[PDB]
Structure 1
């Protein structure tokens, strides 16, 4: 997915969402945020979507 070769659709009914505000003048790659989010998913529950 990180490479431009795959697109994934995750079917969620409803979920808690959180969001971060960045500066448009600062280039960045947002992969670490998702990886952190993935790092805390388990069959018991999930953290809020960033």
Structure 2
């Protein structure tokens, strides 16, 4: 997915969502946010979507 070769659709009915604000004049890659988000998903429950 991180490479431009695969696209994923996740079927979630509803969920708690959080968000972050970034300065437009600062180049960045947001991969770590998703990565750590995945690092907390278990069959018991999931953290909020960033």
CA deviation map 1:4-48 (0-9, x unaligned):
000000000000000000000000000000000000000000000
- Specify every segment of 5 or more residues in structure 1 that has no aligned partner in the other structure, as ranges: none
1:32 counterpart SS class: helix
Superposition map of 1:1-50 within 5 A: 1-50=1-50
TM-score (normalizing by structure 1): 1.00
TM-score (normalizing by structure 2): 1.00
Cα-Cα RMSD: 0.1
- Specify every segment of 5 or more residues in structure 2 that has no aligned partner in the other structure, as ranges: none
